[PDB]
């Protein structure tokens, strides 16, 4: 069937647990791919709004375009190695 993301953070596990570190690595990967899925859906709305609105696309699709331009920098795959090997609070 449709498997699900085992929501597991690096912050709540012991890396010496081989299976727990594997889940946190998988958990971070699956949440980034969903954000890529969401970004593509938003871009689908932008394309349909642009085609239909014609010369009205500047006003009609303004907030859709603004949201796509905001999500684009970070709604991409970043990997799990960066956050696994770095502690932001230190």
């Amino acid at each position: 069937d449709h498997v699900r993301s085992p929501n597991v953070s690096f912050d709540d596990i012991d890396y010496n647990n081989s299976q727990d570190l594997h889940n946190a690595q998988e958990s971070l990967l699956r949440e980034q791919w969903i954000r890529v899925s969401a970004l593509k859906v938003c871009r689908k709305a932008l394309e349909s709004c642009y085609k239909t609105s014609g010369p009205n696309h500047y006003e009609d699709c303004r907030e859709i375009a603004e949201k796509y331009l905001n999500m684009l920098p970070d709604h991409r795959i970043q990997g799990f190695l960066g956050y696994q090997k770095n502690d932001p609070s230190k």
Binding site: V3, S18, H22
Partner: protein, 61 residues
């Protein structure tokens, strides 16, 4: 001969692939979307694969 061994072959591949392609779609209409190749065997899942990974990393430690 326009039906020689070399001209026919691309058309035989094309029609056969379309036929198998259309056959697969019908098979997905009657097996809850499961494909025509499902007879060969299915795909291993995470739980069955985790146990191999768990025993592999324990030995390495």
């Amino acid at each position: 001969n326009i039906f020689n061994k070399w001209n026919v072959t691309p058309f035989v591949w094309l029609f056969a692939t379309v036929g198998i392609f259309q056959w697969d779609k019908s098979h997905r209409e009657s097996h809850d979307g499961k494909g025509i190749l499902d007879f060969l065997g299915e795909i291993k899942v995470k739980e069955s694969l985790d146990t191999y990974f768990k025993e592999y990393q324990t030995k390495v430690a």
